[PDB]
Amino acid sequence: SHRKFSAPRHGSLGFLPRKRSSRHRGKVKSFPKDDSSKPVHLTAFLGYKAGMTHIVREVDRPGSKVNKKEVVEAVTIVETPPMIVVGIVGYVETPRGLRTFKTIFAEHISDECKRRFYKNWHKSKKKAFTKYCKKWQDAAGAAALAADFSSMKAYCQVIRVIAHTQMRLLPLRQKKAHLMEIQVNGGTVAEKLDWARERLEQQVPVNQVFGQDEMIDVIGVTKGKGYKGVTSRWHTKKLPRKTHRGLRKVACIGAWHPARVAFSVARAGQKGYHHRTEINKKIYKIGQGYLIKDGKLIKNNASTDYDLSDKSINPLGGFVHYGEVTNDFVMLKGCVVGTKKRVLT
Amino acid sequence: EGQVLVLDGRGHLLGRLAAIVAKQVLLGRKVVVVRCEGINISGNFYRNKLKYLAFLRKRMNTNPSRGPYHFRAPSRIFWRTVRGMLPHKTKRGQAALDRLKVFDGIPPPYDKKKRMVVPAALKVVRLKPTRKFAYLGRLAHEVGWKYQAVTATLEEKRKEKAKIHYRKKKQLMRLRKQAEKNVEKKIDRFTEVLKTHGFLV
Amino acid sequence: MKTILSNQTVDIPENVDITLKGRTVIVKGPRGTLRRDFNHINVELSLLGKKKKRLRVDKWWGNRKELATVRTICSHVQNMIKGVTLGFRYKMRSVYAHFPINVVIQENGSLVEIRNFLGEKYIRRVRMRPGVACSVSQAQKDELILEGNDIELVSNSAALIQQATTVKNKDIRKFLDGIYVSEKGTVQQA
RNA sequence: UGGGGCGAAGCUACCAUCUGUGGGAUUAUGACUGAACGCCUCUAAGUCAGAAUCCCGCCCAGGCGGAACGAUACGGCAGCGCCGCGGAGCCUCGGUUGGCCUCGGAUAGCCGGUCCCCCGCGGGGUCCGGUGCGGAGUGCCCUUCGUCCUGGGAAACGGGGCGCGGCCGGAGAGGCGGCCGCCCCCUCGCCCGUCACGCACGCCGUUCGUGGGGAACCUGGCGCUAAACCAUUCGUAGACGACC
RNA sequence: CAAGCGUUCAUAGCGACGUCGCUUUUUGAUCCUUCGAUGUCGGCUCUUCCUAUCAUUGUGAAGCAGAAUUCACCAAGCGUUGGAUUGUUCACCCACUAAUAGGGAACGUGAGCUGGGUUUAGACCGUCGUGAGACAGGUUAGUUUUACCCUACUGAUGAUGUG
RNA sequence: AACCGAACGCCGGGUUAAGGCGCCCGAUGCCGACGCUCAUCAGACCCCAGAAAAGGUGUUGGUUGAUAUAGACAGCAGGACGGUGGCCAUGGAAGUCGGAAUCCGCUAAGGAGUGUGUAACAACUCACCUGCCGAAUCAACUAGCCCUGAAAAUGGAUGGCG
Ligand SMILES: [Mg+2]
Ligand SMILES: [Mg+2]
Ligand SMILES: [Mg+2]
Ligand SMILES: [Mg+2]
Ligand SMILES: [Mg+2]
Ligand SMILES: [Mg+2]
Ligand SMILES: [Mg+2]
Ligand SMILES: [Mg+2]
Ligand SMILES: [Mg+2]
Ligand SMILES: [Mg+2]
Ligand SMILES: [Mg+2]
Ligand SMILES: [Mg+2]
Ligand SMILES: [Mg+2]
Ligand SMILES: [Mg+2]
Ligand SMILES: [Mg+2]
Ligand SMILES: [Mg+2]
Ligand SMILES: [Mg+2]
């Protein structure tokens, strides 16, 4: 017999191998469509979550009840010091998918970047990238990187730029940088390459990638919550106070005919630590780190022109539960996925 | 015959071909069907789309990741149809399928090999000219390929290339024929003995 | 019953020069050149008349339903000839009670721009097909002129704006407004 | 948890806050051209518009599915990768010339040649001339298959030394070609003489792709010179396991 | 099919006398399976499917001017609520809306619950019985097991393969 | 189970029944006949495992009746009148809500009317009859094949593949 009294399902399936994520720096899954006409830019970056705050903006939505009123918007602040480009990488299109030719990273490399290779390192001899580098100065420094780029010019189509974060600058206890390919959505390969050629080894800050008031999408991993019963996980009903064996459950899993519990019935399971792509968040402010020309500029952070104090976004006693944001943040409308200190793509 | 087979899927009939492939796979002969986008089907476009979409609804309710795999690439689609004509539960049937091999477009090694055509699965022969149809390419697209565009642009790139070879090969034959005439009185009593027992007339 | 033969000759004028690539007829006269493929219909197109006087379409081992088509090819060919000699002109007269349908062509032909049909704020836009030169008439009040060589192309394009202009959730017995075709003719008449 | 105010941290609530994103095929339907059916016709051959549909895209998982590139065990005893070229021996098998290429049309094609014309040795065009139950035919082409003698003719610079360096071209999942110097060596396809090769005394797995695939060990040259896991710590995570 | 209604007019909408079907959400027949007993009514929760479309998208109808409305097509994409009474399924009313469509899955779902009703043993009235006692005639009290085992599913380690 | 053939010591060869013969899967890897149909739900075998009245110029055959070089059919042009507010009905019905009826002239041919519609006309149209064209045309039945009628619940079965 039918359900007497209809209702929506509890919690979407288009979402549902609700497992502990296999990765942790939010992997970008789709890089925007490179229209070959507009200039070369990077399409992504890699900040990290600090904390949050009361922003007060004047509004300009003619028609609304709040035309020209003050409102407070809750905002995150994403600590985003500049990212170094180490290596470039070329993808060719195929019937079978999108295979990768030729990864080439720089002479030099870094040391934080090294970290994101050999698991336990104080044990290691730190040998990574020691015979690669040797190529950035000889006769075979002209073969396998020159004939190579010529190759990546010829047959290749889509070019990303491997870039490692500067972990050192942060208050995190972490020293292990966050490498990621960031696609270049430029105009034409070669132009989209004699450029990455040039930005090897080189600082890349947030004001290249991003503009203040661009809608962006944040890609990161949900804040962890352990095993949860069905009522916390799938957010179901509770059964009444009477029930002999547990009231934080689902009564009926299935009909004693499709003789399997289904796909799509509510269950106990890992909640949180899930990968998630949140979209279309606004940038309220692109920041600037407190740098020196004489004696600090803490001012150049939270000092809007309509108040002109000398604040840093750092509240009194840090962003509780990591620390002080000492370089370029981006201030994002509302809340973003993930806990504090979290790598946020 | 012996050795590896290469069949050029274009202009064939999806299952009519696959029955012939599958017979020879079971006789130990290695077949390689190529260019499966080109493979075509009797009945009008939509008919077989509608018939495919019927497939896609067939799906193991209690978990679908177990349930039937409705592969979308024509290679894969055809494989399926060949496979249904093998006894693939058993060891000889899986050992059979391994002798098959199937591509969308026409790849390395197989660009570079001459390649054959089953007239008894060939559309112009098997069908009437006043009847309608799908290309498994377009069918495959509207069902969830991602790679009709790519395997187009690559095949156009291959065609342009292959044309060069065809033209250079064309130019060697013109040399052969001119060099027969430029030496036809010290091979004029060998060519004799050719044309006498049939060869070369 | 299969009919051994059916055929038809199109009488081609002295102006035009058709030249058929196998089955594909191309036609060039004064106005321009048209092309069309009968790579479906399956017939034998001969150009028997010397100097150049006859297209003859055969059909040959054909049953009833393909015998039909002898005459249809024969038509799209006359219909080309009239197009490349004379050229067609569909006129379409806007119609109303009240809100003046307010047309404005906007590259050359191409964009036919329609404010105010029935007080509607949404400005309907309509593309023409290639080779179809729309233009607002004169010597008459609410009246477009769609000029082109190709019947096929000229009459989708009539119909596109004739159908873009349709009322909804009313009596279309009563609400007799929109733009619609009044006169299918030619540019030059002879 | 003696009681109760207030209460950081942490969980957590349309009880606070933030964010929910795009294409394609077309149904019904509406249409264009237009046949049957010397008219009319949404259709018989052709087209067009068309959605909470369907499929896809963003989104989530990620294969007895692949990618790229890092480093490759100094040693106190180690063990290997190449490269080449050397000697035995478990085993697991299938095979027993190759074919090195257009595109597609099918009530049509193939090729030649352009005198002529346009484009980038090529491509396109036009004219003519041949083939088209196809003879620069997958009914297809090629290459040979007992050995060497030597002493004529026909044929004469062909081939070789894992002969040796350089420049190409080829990337869809290349794995292959191609094209240039120099050393030494050899003189082979077809006719013929002319002799020869254990002639095993009618007998079977004969012949090769075979320096197969893989698993164990005897020579030289050049390079090499760890990471992983545990323990510890941290928590970004928690049952334990897993992870940062 | 079709006699009628519909001012007129068969067939916008309807439609008699007849007649051809489906359907298994109604009850019957039947007695094929189970009596070394498959938990026997309702409610809650929770999935999924069907369409026999109540809403909404796109459409064709009307006796469609608008407004409002019914007929029908693709169509099952997302909807179908809060209560008073009632063991109830079933009902009726208030209320909201956009709708308050209809159904299936062992008459979906007792090692999910509850146990209100059925349907033990205690009791009470009605009637019948001479009586023990009977009564789809009323009424109040009445123990609701066991998961560790294979499976499905949800997560979690992992696995041969890639030196 | 129960249909069809066929009744079974254990084997080699040959041969068959009922069945089959793209491939699963043995056999058509006949240069097999002659047909019919294209299904936006095809069809595809005695039980047995699906449909009906009823539809259906979807196409193919008949059957019968028609029409016509005195030149039809179809197409484009002209008339479609008068005797005549004919009679009943008046509420209007002069051809026309309805009916008895109900026939001549001009004839060419025009029904005292098929309809639109009009309160009634008109105005329009249709029978009838002409003008223009050139040879086959039309109607009712009846069958063959397909289309519709045709709507169900874990996903989906000519056996599957096709
Ligand atoms: Mg419901
Ligand atoms: Mg209890
Ligand atoms: Mg209305
Ligand atoms: Mg569309
Ligand atoms: Mg249509
Ligand atoms: Mg369209
Ligand atoms: Mg009546
Ligand atoms: Mg039991
Ligand atoms: Mg329906
Ligand atoms: Mg209640
Ligand atoms: Mg039940
Ligand atoms: Mg129980
Ligand atoms: Mg149960
Ligand atoms: Mg009780
Ligand atoms: Mg009792
Ligand atoms: Mg008493
Ligand atoms: Mg008594």
Q: Which SS3 state, helix, strand or coil, does residue A113 take?
A: helix
Task: Provide the token pair at A329.
Answer: 């943040």
Residue of A113, A13, A76, A37 lying closest to A313 (CA atoms):
A76
Residue of A320, A284, A330 lying closest to A72 (CA atoms):
A284
Q: What angle do CA B166, B170, B173 make, to 5 degrees?
A: 140
d(CA A262, CA A37): 50
Task: Provide the token pair at B117.
Answer: 């055509």
Nearest listed ligand to the Cα of residue A245: 2
Task: Provide the token pair at A124.
Answer: 């290691």
Contact flag, residue A3 CB and nucleic strand E, below 7 A: yes
Largest CA distance in chain C: 61
Subunits with 3+ Cβ pairs within 8 Å of B are A, C
Task: Provide the token pair at A38.
Answer: 């507009």
Q: Rounded to 5 degrees, what are φ and ψ at B199? A: -40, 120
Kindly identify which residue of chain B lies nearest to residue A254, measuring between CA atoms.
Answer: B62
Task: Report the Cα A216 to chain-centroid distance in Å.
Answer: 11
What spacing in Å lies between the alpha carbon of C175 and ligand 3's midpoint? 12
d(CA C104, CA C142): 11
Nearest listed ligand to the Cα of residue A247: 2
d(CA A329, CA A79): 4
Nearest listed ligand to the Cα of residue A243: 2
Quote the crossing angle between the two packed helices B14-25 and B74-83, to the nearest 10°. Answer: 60
Strands (E), chain B: 5-8, 31-34, 40-42, 133-135
d(CA B72, CA B50): 14
Sign of the Cα torsion A57, A60, A62, A68 reads positive
Subunits with 3+ Cβ pairs within 8 Å of C are B
Residue of B32, B41, B36 lying closest to B155 (CA atoms):
B36
d(CA C136, CA A62): 39
> If phi over 0 gives left and psi between -120 and 50 gives alpha, with beta otherwise, what is residue A31?
beta
Residue listed under structure tokens 């509004």:
A59
Quote the crossing angle between the two packed helices B148-181 and B136-144, to the nearest 10°. Answer: 160
What spacing in Å lies between the alpha carbon of A252 and ligand 11's midpoint? 13
Residues having Cβ less than 7 A from any atom in strand F: A 257-258; B 14-16, 18-20, 22-23, 26, 43-47, 50, 54, 57-62, 67-68, 80-81, 84-87, 128, 131-132; C 1, 63-65
Q: Which nucleotides of E are covered by protein (CB under 7 A)?
A: 43-49, 59-60, 64-67, 78-82, 90, 103-115, 145, 151-157
Whether C57 contacts C8, CB under 8 Å: yes
Q: Is A317 exposed, middle or buried (0-12, 13-18, 19+ CB in 10 A)?
A: exposed
Task: Provide the token pair at A141.
Answer: 């420094």
- Cα dist from C69 to A282, B3, C95, whole Å: 62, 49, 38
What spacing in Å lies between the alpha carbon of B9 and ligand 16's midpoint? 98
Count of beta carbons in the 10 Å neighbourhood of residue A68: 10
d(CA B51, CA B136): 13
Q: Which residue is nearest to nucleotide D239 (CA to C1')?
A: A227
Task: Provide the token pair at A249.
Answer: 């459950």
d(CA A209, CA A199): 14
Amino acid identity, residue C188? Q
Tally helices (H) and strands (E) across chain C: 2, 15
Task: Provide the token pair at A160.
Answer: 């990303």
β-sheet bridge partners, residue B13: B40
Q: Which SS3 state, helix, strand or coil, does residue A48 take?
A: strand
Whether A238 contacts A231, CB under 8 Å: yes
Question: Resolution (in Å) of the shown entry?
Answer: 3.8
Q: Rounded to 5 degrees, what are φ and ψ at A31? A: -95, 130
d(CA B195, CA B201): 6
Sign of the Cα torsion A120, A123, A124, A126 reads positive
Whether B92 contacts B7, CB under 8 Å: no
Cβ neighbours of residue A251 closer than 8 Å, sequence gap 6 or more: A239
Largest CA distance in chain A: 82
d(CA C173, CA C114): 22
Kindly identify which residue of chain B lies nearest to residue C66, measuring between CA atoms.
Answer: B130
For chain B, the residue count is 201
| Interchain pair B129, C66: CB under 8 A | no
Residue of B133, B153, B150, B132 lying closest to B141 (CA atoms):
B150
CB pairs under 8 A between B and C: 3
Q: Tell me which of A96, A157, A267 to substitute to probe the interface with B (most B C-beta atoms closer than 10 Å).
A: A96
Ion ligand 1, residues whose Cβ is below 5 A away: A 6
Q: Which SS3 state, helix, strand or coil, does residue C10 take?
A: strand
Instruction: Quote the radius of gyration of chain C (alpha carbons, Å).
Output: 20
Q: Which SS3 state, helix, strand or coil, does residue C183 take?
A: strand
d(CA B78, CA B137): 11
Element at B180 (helix H, strand E): helix B148-181
Contact flag, residue A131 CB and nucleic strand E, below 7 A: no
Residue listed under structure tokens 């006359």:
C78
Scanning every strand, the nucleotide with its C1' closest to C164's CA turns out to be D49
| Interchain pair A260, B150: CB under 8 A | no
Return the residues preceding each gap in chain C, C–N over 2.5 A, or none.
Answer: none
Cβ neighbours of residue A313 closer than 8 Å, sequence gap 6 or more: A53, A77, A287, A301, A302, A325, A329, A331
Amino acid identity, residue C171? D
Instruction: Quote the radius of gyration of chain B (alpha carbons, Å).
Output: 22
Residue of B16, B147, B144 lying closest to B70 (CA atoms):
B144
Q: Which SS3 state, helix, strand or coil, does residue A96 take?
A: coil
d(CA A78, CA C88): 66
Residue of A199, A163, A158, A196 lying closest to A179 (CA atoms):
A163
Residue of C71, C76, C77 lying closest to C59 (CA atoms):
C71
Scanning every strand, the nucleotide with its C1' closest to C65's CA turns out to be D44
**What part of B 11-70 touches C (C-beta under 8 Å)?**
none
Whether C179 contacts C144, CB under 8 Å: yes
Residue listed under structure tokens 């033209």:
B167
DSSP codes joined into one string, B33-75: EE-GGG-EEEB-HHHHHHHHHHHHH---SS-TTTS-----SHH
Whether C73 contacts C81, CB under 8 Å: no
Between CA B103 and C1' E116 the distance (Å) reads 68
d(CA A87, CA A296): 33
Sign of the Cα torsion B72, B73, B76, B78 reads positive
What spacing in Å lies between the alpha carbon of A4 and ligand 10's midpoint? 14
Experimental method used, please? cryo-EM
Residue listed under structure tokens 């039937």:
B68
d(CA B188, CA C3): 55
3-state secondary structure A201-241: CCEECHHHHCCCCCEEEEEEECCCCCEECHHHHCCCCCCCC
Count of beta carbons in the 10 Å neighbourhood of residue A149: 19
d(CA C158, CA B32): 52
Sign of the Cα torsion A169, A171, A172, A173 reads positive
Q: Which SS3 state, helix, strand or coil, does residue C159 take?
A: helix
Cβ neighbours of residue C176 closer than 8 Å, sequence gap 6 or more: C95, C97
Whether C12 contacts C46, CB under 8 Å: no
Scanning every strand, the nucleotide with its C1' closest to C72's CA turns out to be D35
Residue of B13, B28, B16, B15 lying closest to B5 (CA atoms):
B28
Q: Please, how many CA atoms are within 13 Å of residue A40, restricted to the half-sphere of its CB?
A: 19
Which of A 285-344 have CB under 7 A of nucleic chain E? Answer: none
Count of beta carbons in the 10 Å neighbourhood of residue B109: 11
Task: Give B-chain residues touching C42 at CB under 8 angstroms.
Answer: 129-130
Secondary structure letter of residue C145 according to DSSP: E
d(CA C154, CA C82): 13
Whether C159 contacts C112, CB under 8 Å: no
d(CA B122, CA A91): 38
Closest Cα in chain C, distance from residue B133 (Å): 12
**Helical ranges in chain A per DSSP H:** 112-115, 148-154, 196-199, 206-209, 230-233
| Interchain pair B105, A95: CB under 8 A | yes
Q: Which nucleotides of F are covered by protein (CB under 7 A)?
A: 22-25, 36, 38-40, 42, 59-61, 154-156, 160-162
SS3 content of chain C, % helix, strand, coil (to 5): 20, 35, 45
Between CA B28 and C1' D92 the distance (Å) reads 19
Between CA C39 and C1' F59 the distance (Å) reads 24
Task: Provide the token pair at B177.
Answer: 């024929």
d(CA A325, CA C35): 70
Scanning every strand, the nucleotide with its C1' closest to A243's CA turns out to be E113
Element at C65 (helix H, strand E): helix C64-85
Element at C89 (helix H, strand E): strand C88-95
Count of beta carbons in the 10 Å neighbourhood of residue C117: 23
Element at C163 (helix H, strand E): helix C151-164
Q: Which nucleotides of D are covered by protein (CB under 7 A)?
A: 9-12, 17-21, 24-27, 30-36, 44-49, 54-62, 65-72, 94-96, 98-109, 111-113, 122-123, 135-138, 141, 154-155, 171-175, 225-231, 234, 236-239, 241-244
| Interchain pair B61, A261: CB under 8 A | no
